[PDB]
Structure formats: structure tokens, C-alpha cells
């Protein structure tokens, strides 16, 4: 059972030991920084390059607050899935949980379902989690 990453520095890249598995939970506990920019991202990808991101979760404190989800494949982005809600507040730590399922990721914010994102590329091929942008991390954990 994988040990958590404690206070990882941002921008962060870490192996997921099993790779994703149906039933796996990944918890990201962090805080958006005030007056340090307007977006951050959590990426589930294959390897460390950044060119093949199965699931890009991208909150943007712009235009009212919204979040974009997308997939990148061979360094081309597909169609964005936007949600016009900002479930994060600057200065407030959040628990952002990703549950892997057969057909989708379920994304919870403090336990409440935020977005469901259907796999565009096979979940089993994901072996890496990455965070970047305007956020400070406290931990990333696995169950």
C-alpha cells in the first residue's frame, strides 16, 4: 500500500505504484495561493514528459470561476469539458479525491462529487500523477 507524498513541492511529478486500478482512490490536499496566478492543474499521465495526459483537471479563477477537463494525446488536446463552478476558495485547504472506476474518474471535492470524467484513453496505462501552477501542496495519498 503506497506511502503518501508529504509536503510535495509544486510543480510535482510522482509515480503511481500500481498504476490506476478500478477502485483506487488518489487524494490531493492543497491550497490555492492568493495573488499568485489564476490556474492550477492535476494531471494523470503516462510517464513524465507531459505529452500524454489521460486526464487534465484544470481549475481557473477567471471569468467567474470555472474548471476545464481535457485529454492530451501525442501533444494534441481534445475537446474541453468545461464546468461553470469553482468548488475551491483561495486560502482554504481542500481534499481533492480521484476515484478510478471502469468507465470514468469520479472527482470529489471535500467528499462531494464535483465532476465525472469518462476515460478517453485506457485508465490502466496511467502510472504517474503531476501537479502544476498556482497551488501549494500538503500531501498526495493512495488507498
Task: Please indicate if the annotation marks 82 as binding a ligand.
Answer: yes
In order of start, what are the domains of the chain with their CATH numbers? 1-143 (2.60.120.200)
Q: Taking a C-beta distance cutoff of 8 angstroms, is the pair 32, 90 a contact?
A: yes
Distance of CA 101 to the CA centre of its chain: 15
Q: Where would I find the beta strands (DSSP E) of the chain? A: 5-6, 12-15, 25-32, 40-45, 53-60, 66-70, 72-73, 76-77, 81-83, 94-100, 104-109, 112-118, 128-133, 135-142
What's the reported resolution, in angstroms, to a tenth?
2.0
Task: Please indicate if the annotation marks 81 as binding a ligand.
Answer: yes
CB atoms within 10 A of CB 14: 15
Q: Which own/partner pairs from 110-117 qualify as long-range (CB within 8 Å, at least 24 positions apart)?
A: 112/87, 114/67, 114/83, 114/85, 114/87, 115/57, 115/67, 115/69, 115/81, 115/83, 117/55, 117/57, 117/69, 117/81
Task: Please indicate if the annotation marks 78 as binding a ligand.
Answer: yes
Q: Taking a C-beta distance cutoff of 8 angstroms, is the pair 142, 2 a contact?
A: yes
DSSP states of 16-32 as a string? Answer: -TT---TT-EEEEEEEE
Q: How far apart are CA 83 and CA 85, in angstroms?
A: 6
Method: X-ray
Q: How far apart are CA 58 and CA 65, in angstroms?
A: 11
Backbone angles phi, psi at 125, to 5 degrees: -80, -10
Q: How far apart are CA 122 and CA 109, in angstroms?
A: 24
Task: Please indicate if the annotation marks 70 as binding a ligand.
Answer: yes
Task: Please indicate if the annotation marks 39 as binding a ligand.
Answer: no
Task: Please indicate if the annotation marks 79 as binding a ligand.
Answer: yes
The DSSP code for 92 is -
Q: Taking a C-beta distance cutoff of 8 angstroms, is the pair 68, 78 a contact?
A: no
Task: Please indicate if the annotation marks 83 as binding a ligand.
Answer: yes
The DSSP code for 9 is -
Amino acid at each position: 500500500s503506497q506511502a503518501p507524498y508529504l509536503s510535495p513541492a509544486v510543480p510535482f511529478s510522482g509515480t503511481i505504484q500500481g498504476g490506476l486500478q478500478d477502485g483506487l482512490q488518489i487524494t490531493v490536499n492543497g491550497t490555492v495561493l492568493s495573488s499568485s496566478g489564476t490556474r492550477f492543474a492535476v494531471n494523470f499521465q503516462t510517464g513524465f514528459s507531459g505529452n500524454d495526459i489521460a486526464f487534465h483537471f484544470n481549475p481557473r479563477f477567471e471569468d467567474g470561476g470555472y474548471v476545464v477537463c481535457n485529454t492530451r494525446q501525442n501533444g494534441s488536446w481534445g475537446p474541453e469539458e468545461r464546468k461553470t463552478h469553482m468548488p475551491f476558495q483561495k486560502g482554504m485547504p481542500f481534499d481533492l479525491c480521484f476515484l478510478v472506476q471502469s468507465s470514468d474518474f469520479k472527482v470529489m471535492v471535500n467528499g462531494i462529487l464535483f465532476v465525472q470524467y469518462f476515460h478517453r484513453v485506457p485508465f490502466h496505462r496511467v502510472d504517474t500523477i503531476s501537479v502544476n501552477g498556482s497551488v501549494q501542496l500538503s500531501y498526495i495519498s493512495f488507498q
